């Protein structure tokens, strides 16, 4: 079963250079657990700005896909998670970007904090993501995601059942600890 998977990663200034590098190592590790052509990937980074590092078409045609993750520079800035999801949902899965009609559409969001200053609300972008059948995973990095204020954030982003689509890790160095878990979740789709 074909899968078109988008990684949407936060590049806000709150993320240290060391942690950003660690996050990219995690993305590379997860991608390395899958094989083309069944699974294809696309990567967008967000802050208050948005950058598509590679589309599904670029990943598909590449003779060395993992290299497309070699020159990813951190954007810095704020964290407009809702608008970022909107940008992914309304662009990265287009046929013109290399997406496949019959493929399962999956979005993996990695963030170190709640959205702040975003002019869009989750209720403004999630309903459409659900209509498109986009399966969403929310990965929250930081002890703050242990409370309620930040917990609800992951629930608003992730597909239901929430528990099966959310991951809370204490720090960026702990991302590697959920690689197998995340892989198993996706392989089950």
Swiss-Prot record:
* Chain residues that bind Mg(2+): 10, 12, 14, 112
> Taking every annotated instance into account, which residue ranges of this chain make up the domain VWFA?
18-189
Expressing tissues? Predominantly expressed in monocytes and granulocytes.
Q: Where in the cell is it found?
A: Membrane
Domain of life of the source: Eukaryota
Function of the protein: Integrin alpha-X/beta-2 is a receptor for fibrinogen. It recognizes the sequence G-P-R in fibrinogen. It mediates cell-cell interaction during inflammatory responses. It is especially important in monocyte adhesion and chemotaxis.
For this chain, the family text in UniProt reads: Belongs to the integrin alpha chain family.
On assembly, the entry states: Heterodimer of an alpha and a beta subunit. Alpha-X associates with beta-2.
In the record's own words, the domains note is: The integrin I-domain (insert) is a VWFA domain. Integrins with I-domains do not undergo protease cleavage.
- Official protein name in the record: Integrin alpha-X
Per the UniProt record, the source organism is Homo sapiens
